[PDB]
Scaffold this active site. Structure first.
Site, short mmCIF file in Angstrom:
data_model
loop_
_atom_site.label_atom_id
_atom_site.label_comp_id
_atom_site.label_asym_id
_atom_site.label_seq_id
_atom_site.Cartn_x
_atom_site.Cartn_y
_atom_site.Cartn_z
N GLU A 54 0.78 -1.23 0.00
CA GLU A 54 0.00 0.00 0.00
C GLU A 54 0.82 1.30 0.00
O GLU A 54 0.73 2.11 0.93
CB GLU A 54 -0.96 -0.01 1.19
CG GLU A 54 -1.95 -1.16 1.17
CD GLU A 54 -2.99 -1.07 2.28
OE1 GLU A 54 -2.97 -0.08 3.04
OE2 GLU A 54 -3.82 -2.00 2.38
N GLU A 87 -5.20 -8.95 0.61
CA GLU A 87 -5.79 -8.49 1.86
C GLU A 87 -7.29 -8.31 1.76
O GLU A 87 -7.79 -7.69 0.83
CB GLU A 87 -5.15 -7.18 2.31
CG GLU A 87 -3.90 -7.33 3.12
CD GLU A 87 -3.50 -6.04 3.78
OE1 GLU A 87 -4.39 -5.31 4.26
OE2 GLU A 87 -2.28 -5.75 3.82
#
Lengths: 489, 489, 489, 489
Positions: B206, B387
């Site tokens: 991220e 995720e």
């Protein structure tokens, strides 16, 4: 760790009327309950939900699927009942050598000849089908507790609408000793035909609810729904005799253990100065009934008698526990308090801050320990937790409810109580009487359209417990109260 | 039924900083994040929870217990990261031949000699311990995705407090090309030493959140917490170069696949006339970044360029999905709306009536299908759902959340998207950055006192999925929205 | 019955920046706050709501309507402030005899000649308009408390964005003694021109919030939003001097009473063993500040001095009370607890079970009695409850909140505290700083479209109180906690 | 603005049994209702709350305080009733030349001689006290609507317990034409003695609820609580005759207007294809009854007839409105839906998202406009909104409920409907029949301990309306739905 005795068994309980119907050809229209929930006036008054049993789980036709799932879940014991109405749907000729005006029924003659003649009136198809269901159950290694009665009465023995209207000239169910008489014979008959499949017997299920809600708590929508303290006592008196007579009838044909299943609650004191209120409640809701069928101590009219024909008619006690009942002393007697136990708001919290089910019942595991030990220390008869569960369609609380109560049973065993099994209230959702299908107590969710069964997460948790015969370390955290912050208040 | 491809793998993702510490000897004080959450002013301002990483799950010492549980759950793939700070806790000498004033970093020389010399500065103990952790992981048959960076930067490369105060004369993290340079070398170094254990690599996790929350969404409590649109762009520009350079560094030492893991959201139109707002949002939050590292199309300063040193630096895409983001076309461009996606009330319901997690994130499975297919149709690079999870300590919604999103992945595969795995966000609870330990995303509950792990019911459900490589018929009902009636509003 | 002293007055408080703008021609763009809430980065970061002051209640143009409604409500006192920025929108020449490096400002020369010259820089239009507003206020018989400062600073004295970025080379607001110097002169100037209309003066409003949220609680979205314990102390030190110098400036031109308005909270012990934590909190949040401007005891650098130029600069205390603050003793200090007072969930209940407002503030009337009596027993200076109210658009809790706190003021008076009035926080809704217009504290609801005012039921209740100078028997039941059963949890 | 006709009056309605008792000497034990709520079995069954009327508001002794408060509130009309049981507590001799077996009662001879003889059996003390109460009412300028019956029947005419048990050999209330006969005489008697004080008469209050809940909706806990569709029809038939005969009796002694008060609901279509269901519901719940007493069209047994003795017996219609009733067409007829109107959860929201009262009734103002206009367009008889209110102890919704429905009445008047007044259901809280004191409908809160009255904020709002004969601009915003965000879901 919390391991159970080697002989201890984990399973489930189920009722015929609540689970049988649903598949084509399973309709049973000959019970007071069937007529009761189909009654136009009861529906209009909202006494009954409007849902109909005919649209149920369909156990009558899908029993193999039920049993297979129980097997996969590791269950090893099951308690079911036969529906009297399916066996004897037609009226039996009024029995002679019988005076209905007589208050007491101290004995009912049961012999092979009587059974042979009774057998001629029996519905062989229903009888044969039950045998198939039970044979499948046994062939899967499941211990089997056969219960004789779970509320519905054949219509020829009870027209609930007639009685609800105040007319007592017809079949009056438990208000008639004729029912007591026929029940004894019926019980003997079933044991006579199923003894080879049965491990342990139970005469009836929650007789106290039958007489209590039927003649006092009329807002509950139970037949005949006629409000009368007096007739409630008469009903309970007769049901007590029925039990004793049924116990003797079965014993004439079998050597297997014969007990009874009762609706229990853990009476808790609102304050530390309400201890006497608890005892009073326990006497009025528990002890009076069991001292009658065990000690033979009963009260007919206004005298405290001791009937020898009632003494010692019990081998084991079936404990049905769901929640507590908080009471307070009030000069004369005591009073139950709303906002606790069974009297809470649905999907909310009790006055004590404990989560409530879809049915509005408060989460209170400790109560189960209380009831088990109380029964043990008084009569020392071994018992089974024949019912324990929660109306929870979403399955938010069931995991905590399941593990917590099982833990309490473990705790009672370590105190010395002889508890031989735990039967969760139902493998799958079913018909919740006056409430309909909206109250879902199953470990397995039922799609009433397809009749398909689904495994709620708690059934996976239960499989861990049954399979290991213990609350494994990995799921120990579930022995706690469901967090209330995320739940509705 | 919903079965997945034979090669499809189910597993979990985890971060070093969030899960490693907790056991004695595991303390790592040399990261900007560690200093950041221990900062007195940040605590006083409430930018950080006050909880400390030192009190975590203790994966550093209890990895075997983690792995054993994953094995018992049927997991076959895992994605973890190495903490740069543990490898190189001490400052490396300023590189020669490097001009920090230069805006672009089109290449970093990496050769065995460089790696040999770099190796002299490495902490062998940490390096050896990681090898042990990974060897245990592999010896259990788990596929292994090695991620190089998951937010924390070694302190000698970034003093977050200094920058937060407006002082840019010290180690400025992603604001310095020095960091880019060192990251490339670091990535190559790790691949050079762990390639025998790795199946697939990921440069970073991220990166968009790092630059986004670090320099714009300062209320989130992420370092350096300095509000600046401009510095946010510089940070993202450098992190993009870092990725490309790290990709080349790893490829110099390995032939294994190298991708990146991104924070995603499904942009939904408030109205049917907000379709253009969605596209705009997708460009500003997704496409711009990937067109840069895939198409080489980037924009430095104010000129739209195409850097060949950036083109084609990606083999696969890691999708991190949690919820949607509703947008509306407004005065100028578009606007995200509160009361939806990530901007909802905790343990409540969104403006759309969908349940929200303990973190206030809205339940929206479909969004995952949207993101997966969107990525596929644009770049046609295979991907992993790296995720997906939910902050839910009680485990009320996780069962529904798990099954529902897994179903969406199945649906995307049938649309033709090449998705090779699903990694639930975390096996066990961990440190949720600025939020602390209160946000529990684990399939396994962690008792932070004993460091003991517990199986939430949803982990039993996940075991069914992993074990069968499909959503079995028995748990299909979980492919639905958690009932909101029993939940808090 | 609960009657108040004959001279006791009931009224309201209001701020210029929060209520003035809204009507055409009322725009004031020259304040740090105006620039602050219009800043693109602050909006993107969510530090400010996005709502703009320009769209406010429009008191600047509709004051007569405000005043007329206050009159109909029976109010007899009002506390408003003049916006420094409207008077002196343009930069004043730097002071000649002023050394900004000097830490202390023990005196500022103020004489008629200085005032005459200062007057040449003043905006006569704004000055004349204020006079009209105040003349209308006075012509209606309302007692008038003139407050000199309520947060916004003219831009030529403070560029909040510059400072937020870490650049301290420009106008730094309360970080510069230049601001202190100019504030003293400004205060004297206003008193010099409005003394004929003023009954009592107040130098500033909640100086502690200005320095506290501005440099420590940066998530609150207050300018300059630069996190620094040290700069927070410097700001508070200067604001303290500013008060003292402003007190002397006003006294050079007037004989009227001069006090200050402070942001208060009732510090409550979590446990009976947290009594010492309360005292510590009271010292750090209350006593230190007032002992400075009353006792002259202050601490500059790291020495506990006593400045004679600060001693005795206060005639009365303005109490702003909204809720409590629960604390617990920790280590050598203490800690405030979330879930109580100001740190609760919006439209919910606190950890204690008390209802919370639209702003998430807990209902706690007793706290007002605590603060009033605490102040009285320590300094024996008379006071006014200058602010008390609740963010409640629906008006569900305001009736209870209003009556309950007014009752507490009555209780404090009977204890001997000299409280001369109660000013509810706002007649009408207004701009809640970083929060925007969503937080409505008015007795009168404002339709921001038409700028029309509506009477919430609580304003009818307040009229009963003001009109009778007491809590009449008919509304006594409102002196209780708003029932939580019907409210959201 | 919303102003009402000059002759339009705002006031309140009240019932004797619900408000009279509470003060010493006010006990009235001779009604079926009194015996009903004191019954041990009804209490045990939970049919009645357990609260007792003897502990009421005490209007019997505190009427002056009630009236004085109504005066202060600007009310100018009041509708109360005399309790038949107080006038004739003892059994009257059977009527000669009267045949109880006769189905119809087409006439009852009423002349001065009959009245004179009847007067000898009357309780002069009760009669004189009523005159005092009404004289006080009139001396205050309040218009007075005298209602003759509001549910309770003297015990010598109806033993509810006897009937509940299925025994129909005793006083059977509305199941006996004897009751019809005596009611006509009683009505004439009262008018004969109070005509000088009365402005307008009403024969009875909500006769449909009496027969409906008494014989069909037995879970409501209304006497005799005997479930029977057939007996419900007989009761309604007799009550219809009673009305007609009472109308003629009164007209023999007075020239004043004589109407009736009915329980109404606005029947709403679930879908746009349920329009026919609405009409059917309106016929079964409204039109059938009024076409009988207005058009003389009735159906006795199963014969549709037109009785001239019933035709034209009505001068005005009293509308009692609280909420809607949603219906859906279903093959044969239609069905009411739970989760709407009267069938909602308490202190929650309906299936439509509208707030519900403490009684579980949905907020639906428009329904009042529907009912008023419907009645007008069919019969063109002028009417009064004789009842409108809400169970809301906290007073969170009453302000909105009050203003919104008053607005709907204004809207109906502008459509041309002749509505001459609005009487809010009760000035003060009172005994809510089977529900007890927990359901508080008063504008004034009652402390049942001291019997003291308190002004809820909504009573201050009502004073504004009554006083101005209109919804003033300042409170117009209350013509909206109470915000649901802050309320419980």
């Amino acid at each position: 760790m919390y391991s159970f005795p080697n002989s201890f068994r984990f399973g489930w309980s189920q009722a015929g009327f609540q689970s049988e119907m649903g598949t084509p050809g399973s309709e049973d229209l000959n019970t007071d309950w069937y007529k009761w929930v189909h009654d136009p006036e009861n529906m209009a008054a909202g006494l009954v939900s409007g849902d109909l049993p005919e649209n149920g789980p369909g156990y009558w036709g899908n029993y193999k699927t039920f049993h297979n799932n129980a097997q996969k879940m590791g269950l090893k014991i099951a308690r079911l009942n036969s529906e009297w109405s399916r066996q004897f749907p037609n009226p039996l000729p009024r029995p002679q050598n019988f005076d209905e005006s007589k208050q007491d029924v101290t004995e009912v003659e049961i012999n092979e000849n009587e059974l042979k003649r009774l057998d001629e009136y029996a519905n062989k198809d229903a009888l044969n089908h039950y045998r198939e269901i039970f044979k499948d159950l046994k062939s899967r290694g499941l211990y089997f507790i056969q219960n004789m009665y779970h509320w519905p009465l054949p219509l020829w023995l009870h027209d609930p609408i007639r009685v609800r209207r105040g007319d007592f000239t017809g079949p009056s169910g438990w208000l008639s000793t004729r029912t007591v008489y026929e029940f004894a014979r019926f019980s003997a008959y079933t044991a006579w035909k199923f003894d080879d499949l049965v491990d342990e017997y139970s005469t009836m299920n929650e007789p106290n609810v039958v007489g209590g809600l039927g003649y006092v708590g009329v807002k509950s929508g139970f037949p005949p729904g006629y409000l009368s303290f007096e007739l409630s006592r008469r009903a309970m008196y007769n049901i007590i005799q029925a039990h004793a007579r049924a116990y003797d009838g079965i014993k004439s044909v079998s050597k297997k253990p014969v007990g009874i299943i009762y609706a229990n609650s853990s009476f808790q004191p609102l304050t530390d100065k309400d201890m006497e209120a608890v005892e009073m409640a326990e006497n009025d809701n528990r002890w009076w009934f069991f001292d009658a069928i065990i000690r033979g101590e009963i009260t007919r009219g206004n005298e405290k008698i001791v009937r020898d024909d009632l003494k010692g008619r019990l081998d084991w006690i079936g404990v049905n526990y769901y929640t507590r009942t908080v009471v307070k002393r009030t000069g004369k007697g005591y009073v139950s308090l709303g906002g606790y136990g069974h009297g809470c708001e649905r999907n909310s919290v009790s006055l004590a801050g404990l989560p409530t089910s879809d049915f509005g019942w408060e989460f209170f595991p400790e109560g189960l320990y209380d009831v088990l030990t109380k029964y043990w220390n008084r009569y020392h008869l071994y018992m089974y937790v024949t019912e324990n569960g929660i109306a929870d369609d979403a399955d938010y609380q069931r995991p905590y409810y399941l593990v917590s109560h099982v833990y309490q049973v473990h705790r009672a065993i370590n105190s010395g109580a002889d508890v031989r099994g735990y039967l969760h209230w139902s493998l799958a959702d079913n018909y919740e009487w006056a409430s309909g299908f909206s109250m879902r107590f199953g470990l397995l969710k039922v799609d009433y359209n397809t009749k398909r069964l689904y495994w709620r997460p708690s059934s996976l948790v239960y499989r861990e417990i049954a399979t290991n015969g213990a609350i494994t370390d990995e799921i120990e955290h579930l022995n706690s109260v469901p967090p209330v912050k995320p739940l509705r208040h």
